Design a protein around this ligand. Structure first.
Ligand SMILES: Cc1ncc(C[n+]2csc(CCOP(=O)(O)O)c2C)c(N)n1
Ligand SMILES: Cc1ncc(C[n+]2csc(CCOP(=O)(O)O)c2C)c(N)n1
Lengths: 256, 256
């Protein structure tokens, strides 16, 4: 009861996009300062939630908490943590967390149970959690992706009640795309994201599933972001390498 | 009752050196493979325990567990973890862990209590733990080092019984030396290490204190390692950047 005079122009839809930067690996306290100068000097007119994930390493989070002021940016913790670690995070007004592969993989092989526990402990303390799931290249080559991907989100979901999903973001980031220059095709991304959503729709709720954001991560850059975002089931990006460059702004723009 | 015919030639002494490589930041599954080819092809004749800490990231730990065979090398986990994470580590025959700054600092400011808990949980599952302590540049400039350093190890110690120290290694790595090219002078290192040992001697036992290894970490490379190791209270090195280069071999040799 709220369309125009004429059909369409689209079947979506689409929750609000996120564009997340993970600065886990950078030792340039200076250029980072400059980056967030760029970010601040940057007019983002559409509805997108931008996230920056600094390390303690070098300037990093201290610099960011101080010098980043843009209204569409929040700061997230990387991993985290103990119950003390969460209590500490609250104290410093950090309310987002990125969880995923380190956690699943740090301890020599698929500890999804740890991912699930961490996501839930976090949601339980009121955090927004970006949860990452993805196959390895081996699992991809052997056509195990669908099984692996579902296994991972089933784990995360087991520890959550329907209402927790309000605070959950999913990042689909295949391990073979991380730092490798091998990004998923828009068709791959769409496929996996669609799979994930169909799972959430069925097992949690269609209500929840349409509101859920599933970000794509893995070798996203200025070039490939738009075509990727075009996909029906992509709601933004988890970005590592290119997040440390002025092109992150372009990754953000692609999210419109 | 076991000297030669003639005094000296030294007042030490000195427990067995460690030379630890932390590969937290490297995306070159190929060159790493080559590195450990170099490490394997490398004859280390003296008593030194070499440690390599791979990430899950890229090839990394999978590659290392497979391809590293040298008898004087063990593999350590980076951080870790949950009780599941430790249980997982045991399963894969990983028996060493590096804990420190991420842990103390990940959650926006000095969570030493987390470091202590983690070190003890680890020692309790039978792990060798390399525990890192260090001031920030601010704390250094303002002459707060002694207070900060002691605060940190006092925390670690609180959760340990005298016999746990058998499994504890201390890494003194000032945060201002990490990835910054600003390494401690041999005199700084000696000072801090000496402080730490005097603390352990007094509060834990002189017995324990002389057997304890305190490694120096922070911008160690082929050039500076020897002069550093020469110091009475330095028992080796925690090495990040230069550990990813053929010069790590030289850092190892310096430990003789
Ligand atoms: C707790 C935790 N720590 C780290 C990670 C890994 N990680 C998070 S951001 C990013 C995306 C960009 O890579 P690229 O350089 O290709 O843009 C990667 C692959 C995780 N999933 N969970
Ligand atoms: C759990 C945990 N994760 C990470 C760290 C940091 N970190 C460990 S190895 C290394 C030494 C070489 O730096 P450089 O590049 O100067 O040789 C640094 C500074 C810690 N203390 N605890």
């Amino acid at each position: 009861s709220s369309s125009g005079l004429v059909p369409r122009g689209s079947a979506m839809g689409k929750p609000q996009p996120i564009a997340a930067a993970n600065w886990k690996c950078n030792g340039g306290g200076q250029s980072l300062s400059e980056l967030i100068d760029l970010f601040n000097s940057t007019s983002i007119n559409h509805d997108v939630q931008c996230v920056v994930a600094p390390s303690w390493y070098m300037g990093a989070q201290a610099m960011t908490k101080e010098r980043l002021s843009h209204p569409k940016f929040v700061i997230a913790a990387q991993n985290a943590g103990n119950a003390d670690a969460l209590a500490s995070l609250k104290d410093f007004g950090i309310s987002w967390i990125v969880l995923g592969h380190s956690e699943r993989r740090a301890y020599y092989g698929e500890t999804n149970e740890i991912v699930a526990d961490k996501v839930a402990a976090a949601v339980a303390s009121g955090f927004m959690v970006i949860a990452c799931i993805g196959e390895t290249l081996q699992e991809r080559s052997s056509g195990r992706t669908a099984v692996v991907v579902l296994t991972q989100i089933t784990a995360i979901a087991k520890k959550l009640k329907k209402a927790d999903w309000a605070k959950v973001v999913i990042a689909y980031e295949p391990v073979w795309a991380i730092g490798t220059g091998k990004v998923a095709t828009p068709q791959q991304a769409q496929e996996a994201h669609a799979l994930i959503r169909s799972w959430v729709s069925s097992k949690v709720g269609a209500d929840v599933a349409g509101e859920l954001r599933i970000l794509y991560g893995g070798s996203v850059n200025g070039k490939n972001a738009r075509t990727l975002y075009q996909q029906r089931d992509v709601n933004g990006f988890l970005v590592g390498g290119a997040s440390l460059k002025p092109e992150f702004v372009d990754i953000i723009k692609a999210t419109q």
